[PDB]
C-alpha cells in the first residue's frame, strides 16, 4: 500500500531495526521503503512468528520485534498501525 512514487524513497533505519534487518542477511545502512518491508516480512516468516491458523496474527512478545514495535502482538490487517510502528524506527530522506 506504499504509493509507487514512495516505494523507492530512501530511509535510514535506527539501530534496533538495523539489527533486525541484518539478521535476515541484509548488509546495507540505507534502504528503500519497499526493501524494509520485504525484510521485515522475511524475518517474520523465517522466525515463524505468525499464527498458523489465523495468519494475520503475529506474536512477538518474546522477540526483538515486540521491543522494536512496542506491542506484544499485532494484526497484519492493521496497515496504518504497522506503518506508524515502522516510521518510528526509520528516518525518511526528504
Amino acid at each position: 500500500q506504499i504509493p509507487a512514487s514512495e516505494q523507492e524513497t530512501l530511509v535510514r533505519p535506527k539501530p534496533l531495526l538495523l539489527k533486525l534487518l541484518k539478521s535476515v542477511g541484509a548488509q546495507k545502512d540505507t534502504y528503500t521503503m519497499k526493501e524494509v518491508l520485504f525484510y521485515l516480512g522475511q524475518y517474520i516468516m523465517t522466525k515463524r512468528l505468525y499464527d498458523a491458523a489465523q495468519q494475520h496474527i503475529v506474536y512477538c512478545s518474546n522477540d526483538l520485534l515486540g521491543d522494536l514495535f512496542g506491542v506484544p502482538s499485532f494484526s497484519v490487517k492493521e496497515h496504518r498501525k504497522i506503518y506508524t510502528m515502522i516510521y518510528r524506527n526509520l528516518v525518511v530522506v526528504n
Binding site: 500500500q1 506504499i2 516505494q7 519497499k34 518491508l37 520485504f38 521485515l40 516480512g41 517474520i44 516468516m45 505468525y50 495468519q55 494475520h56 497484519v76 490487517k77 496497515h79 504497522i82 506503518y83
Partner: peptide, 16 residues
C-alpha cells in the same frame, strides 16, 4: 499487501 496492495489470507499475501 503492506507493500503494493496485494490481497489474500495467507501471511505472505497479507504482508505483501
Amino acid at each position: 499487501g503492506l507493500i503494493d496492495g496485494t490481497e489474500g489470507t495467507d501471511f505472505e499475501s497479507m504482508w505483501r
